[PDB]
Design a protein around this ligand. Sequence first.
Ligand SMILES: CCCCCCCCCCCCCCCC(=O)OC[C@H]1O[C@H](O[C@@H]2[C@H](O)[C@@H](O)[C@H](O)[C@@H](O[C@H]3O[C@H](CO)[C@@H](O)[C@H](O)[C@@H]3O)[C@@H]2OP(=O)(O)OC[C@@H](COC(=O)CCCCCCCC[C@H](C)CCCCCCCC)OC(=O)CCCCCCCCCCCCCCC)[C@@H](O)[C@@H](O)[C@@H]1O
Ligand code: HEM
Ligand code: HEM
Ligand SMILES: CCCCCCCCCCCCCC(=O)O[C@H](COC(=O)CCCCCCCCCCC)COP(=O)(O)O
Lengths: 73, 143, 49, 533, 139, 184
Amino acid sequence: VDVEDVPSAEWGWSHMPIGVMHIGGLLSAAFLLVMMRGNHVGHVEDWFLIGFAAVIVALVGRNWWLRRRGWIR
Amino acid sequence: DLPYGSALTSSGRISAVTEPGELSVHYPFPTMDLVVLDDALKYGSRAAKARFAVYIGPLGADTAATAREILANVPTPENAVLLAVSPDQRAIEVVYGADVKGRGIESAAPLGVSAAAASFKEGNLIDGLISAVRVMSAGVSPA
Amino acid sequence: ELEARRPFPERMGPKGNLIYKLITTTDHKLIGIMYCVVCFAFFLVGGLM
Amino acid sequence: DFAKLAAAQGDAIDSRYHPSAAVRRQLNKVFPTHWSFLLGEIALYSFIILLLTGVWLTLFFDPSMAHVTYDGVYQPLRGVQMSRAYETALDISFEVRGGLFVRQVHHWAALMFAASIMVHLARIFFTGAFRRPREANWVIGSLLLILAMFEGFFGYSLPDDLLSGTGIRAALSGITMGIPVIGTWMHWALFGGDFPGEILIPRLYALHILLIPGIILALIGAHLALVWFQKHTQFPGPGRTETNVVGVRVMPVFAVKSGAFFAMITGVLGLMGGLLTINPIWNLGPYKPSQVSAGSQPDFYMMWTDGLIRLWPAWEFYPFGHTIPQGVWVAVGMGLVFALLIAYPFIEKKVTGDDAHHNLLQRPRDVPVRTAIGSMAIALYLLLTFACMNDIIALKFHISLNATTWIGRIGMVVLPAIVYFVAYRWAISLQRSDREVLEHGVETGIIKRLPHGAYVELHQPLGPVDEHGHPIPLEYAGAPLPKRMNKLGSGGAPGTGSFLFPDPAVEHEALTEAAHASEHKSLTALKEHQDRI
Amino acid sequence: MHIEARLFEILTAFFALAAVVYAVLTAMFATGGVEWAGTTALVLTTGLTLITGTFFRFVARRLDTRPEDYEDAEISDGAGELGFFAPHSWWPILISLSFSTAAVGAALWLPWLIAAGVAFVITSVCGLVFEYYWGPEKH
Amino acid sequence: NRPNMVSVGTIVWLSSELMFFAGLFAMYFTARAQAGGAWPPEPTELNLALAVPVTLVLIASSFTCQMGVFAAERGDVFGLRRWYVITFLMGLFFVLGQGYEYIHLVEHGTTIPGSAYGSVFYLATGFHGLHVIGGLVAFVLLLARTKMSKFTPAQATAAIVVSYYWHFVDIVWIALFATIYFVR
Ligand SMILES: CCCCCCCCCCCCCCCC(=O)OC[C@H]1O[C@H](O[C@@H]2[C@H](O)[C@@H](O)[C@H](O)[C@@H](O[C@H]3O[C@H](CO)[C@@H](O)[C@H](O)[C@@H]3O)[C@@H]2OP(=O)(O)OC[C@@H](COC(=O)CCCCCCCC[C@H](C)CCCCCCCC)OC(=O)CCCCCCCCCCCCCCC)[C@@H](O)[C@@H](O)[C@@H]1O
Ligand code: HEM
Ligand code: HEM
Ligand SMILES: CCCCCCCCCCCCCC(=O)O[C@H](COC(=O)CCCCCCCCCCC)COP(=O)(O)O
């Protein structure tokens, strides 16, 4: 990172690669979706899992698209 | 001599107005193209530690003396790299201060002129400015 | 009379620009903005009801 | 008399052992005075109190699983069948004067020991104190934390009451026997057969009073010796370098402070032991496999593991006529956690590429990625710990128990991600807050209206100024910046006297002048040392 | 600041008249006689405006005209220091979290949570009140 | 030459806090109008041998508080501390005297669940007592702040507004004492 983005960039670990966070988000979403497999008989929680996974996938996709298009760095 | 609705205040600042529904800025280019040029300027200047500037307007007859006159208006002009363009006279000028000499700008400034000229022949003014800034800043080192 | 400007004003502040302000601010302008944002989120919640 | 005796004994000691130079080296050793460097010795003092009270307890405890009929004073359990271990735990708390107090001080000291280890670990991790040359000593500490967890678990399993026996049946017996291929062999080696058997409590007792505490004592000795001879880290500040230690010598200041802190920690643990009930085992009854109670939590330092059991889904595999049950996941998970904790310094030097000697600490704001990672880890730890108490929380706070399970399950993925992002941005935000004071000085809070109507806040520069009067921007030096004018001395002092009556004005004047002169001399000494080096 | 006092005195006149009228009109030909809740509320609303108006009226007759009370004051009349205005603080959010802890404790009737919340409130309010008065650390 | 801003804010807030007691007075008078002739009803026996001395101690705490204010306006931090310590001790005595009255009332069968009179009596006097406890906390915090820095005009203003609150609490008690122990 540049010091304009992280002022103490030369004092410590200041950069995490974006691929790590994108892949971690996708894997976390997939893990939310795999907990639909279980013994539970209700589906309220299935909808909560689907919604949280959808929000995560949308955030990852927005970030990836905006980095590709150059709007954020 | 002040525009309508503009006032000189007790601090020397100008307090201006716009008619409701009208714009303050009105540059004849799309907003997202202006954002792209702004990012090109900012991140080119950060990567080279030299302030990059762009001029659009009439450059006169010599057009290099005028460009050197305009460079005095860039902040910290000794460390600045100005690209001035006259769409009418169809002229491209690059002028830089002394702090930037010896940092890679003699190689990159003509490359910036070529990059601008290639896009101008297609009728793409802002695209030419963006491309030229990108090539010239990629060729200057923070030295 | 050439004043240097930016081609477009900055879209957002840098990273770290906002979050500590939000929890330490005594600026009535920022507090008013925070009120407007949170009140509108509550408006959406009540409208969903 | 008292001085001649000291000289005579000193000469007798020096003629026989000639220890003068080594002793003097110990007296002149310098320790930094930062408040957070006192976190490790809370753990040390808790361990010492545990040793003393535990030795007292072994004089009365019979760890036998032999079944007997209770013949003691506690009427609600008269005639009830119980082990000798539960019997003698009751005898300690009712038939030995001071036994209940000693037992409660022991258990509170165990809780403070685990909590101190956790907080001290957080300091080590967030300040970067694990970096070379100190990787091994982080590893030793990690082992100390694991051993403390299992030592406390074995300790509260000893009385063989219903609650702790329920904990033994599920965790020590159930998870173990679930282990693939070797699970049941490990169970029958540990228990001597099936649960509960007859050897478990005597064996755990031997592990708890001698074997594990001996390993812990050896590891603590190695740990403190490494700290002592590697010379404690310090924060950046005036006069502090990578090659020096700024602080106070052992004799007398650090010794007095350490002894007084030990006395105060002992006082707190003694007040807790005789003001707050912990583990009143007579209310629980003896352990019987047919009985159970609602609310089967372990001690807090084990809760996360229990929380993991509660949250992980019922995922099992049945390959070729065999069974891999759910608990295996938890076992693997625990190993993974421990392996990641022990290995962290080497992971970070592999990722960052930084393999330099480090004696100056990092402020947590200045290492935003590691601070975000540690905050993420603490968020996961807290979520698992509260998942373990999900049934209590459901009862007290009116949440569906099913809902708490699903909140823990989803939050186990979502809360660490949110916490990581927030902590990262918050750390960079504190960096920017420091930068602001560096360019503009300290905001004093005093607003002024200029003659033309401008409003300006007065700033106090931290360095030299311009001819225009604005401060010259200062460079960040890894050290904290003042942000309140009162912390720079702007408030002055009230006026010398008792709380109700003033002293004579001449006394006040002399005292104030002496205080200002001393403060200036101290600042000048640090400044000139810094200028020289 | 005579207008500031006058505003509250005018409100006071209306509130006192309304309180007297309501008490007298409900005592006569209203079922049960005096309606005590509304009468009490009107009397003490009158008291509220009376306290503030009397304070403003006493303050006004002390100090002579301020630049904001002067019809043709100049901007430069107001030059100088205004006072202290806190530049930043994270103590307000701590106070509100503490008070919300005590409130959740009172809602669910958990006396230990109420005790913890009250202790949190006292600590947070001390943190706010002392923030600009703690001296330097001493060593 | 200008209003004390902290003073005006404190006065404005105190006037608002009068409406909070308006609600409780409304509750009391509603329950009293529905009494049916017996007010206080049996077995409640109010005793003035103890309410009156506690009331007088609380009134005298106002004079001691005003003395502290005069010292603060004079710039005398030690006189302010002495008078505010005396005021704190007297208000603490008021709180303990009220608690003793409560204890003797509960043993004879006047409680919050027991009767409508007990409900209004205890909410009214107990919320006033909570206000007294808040004022004692305020005295403690103010006195600790005078030891933190030199005695400035802002510090004296803080003392003055704490006294405004204490006088409000005393006057509210006079009103509550008149309506409960004499306008029965
Ligand atoms: C808000 C934002 C989004 C957009 C705006 C609004 C969206 C929300 C709209 C949802 C509407 C739901 C219905 C409302 C009414 C209600 O109250 O419910 C009805 C009834 O329902 C249950 O009866 C089912 C039948 O009606 C009965 O006939 C049947 O018998 C019964 O059978 C069960 O029980 C039997 C024994 O009795 C067993 O025999 C049998 O096998 C079975 O188990 C049934 O139950 P069951 O299927 O369990 O549950 C299912 C119920 C239960 O309600 C529910 O919707 C559950 C609640 C869902 C909550 C959604 C969470 C959203 C995620 C978060 C936003 C993520 C985080 C992001 C935040 C900020 C992000 C910014 C950073 O319906 C549903 O899910 C409806 C389906 C659709 C839900 C919507 C999902 C949207 C998300 C997907 C997209 C992602 C978002 C995009 C991102 C970009 C019983 O309970 C009944 O009492 C109850 O009466
Ligand atoms: C029984 C448990 C432990 C005890 C009694 C203990 C005790 C201490 C003490 C007294 C110190 C020196 C003073 C200080 O900085 O606080 C210290 C330093 C240290 N501890 Fe621990 N510790 C324990 C566990 C741990 C853990 C869990 C870690 C980390 C995983 C750790 C790593 C370190 C390191 C790296 C140092 C030296 C730090 C420095 O110089 O600044 N220890 N320990
Ligand atoms: C790391 C150190 C230790 C920890 C964390 C620890 C923890 C515990 C705990 C939690 C208990 C249950 C207490 C209870 O009854 O309520 C216990 C019991 C016991 N511990 Fe320790 N202990 C430690 C060290 C020692 C040592 C060194 C001894 C022996 C000298 C000892 C002797 C005992 C005995 C005899 C009991 C059983 C009697 C009883 O429960 O009351 N402990 N321990
Ligand atoms: C620990 C048991 C005995 C403790 C007494 C020893 C310390 C006092 C003796 C020396 C100080 C006074 C001056 C003096 O007598 O000078 C000399 C004694 O000291 C020495 O030279 C050797 C002392 C080294 C031993 C210390 C080891 C541990 C002691 C630390 C205890 C806190 C004798 O003076 P002289 O010969 O008359 O010039």
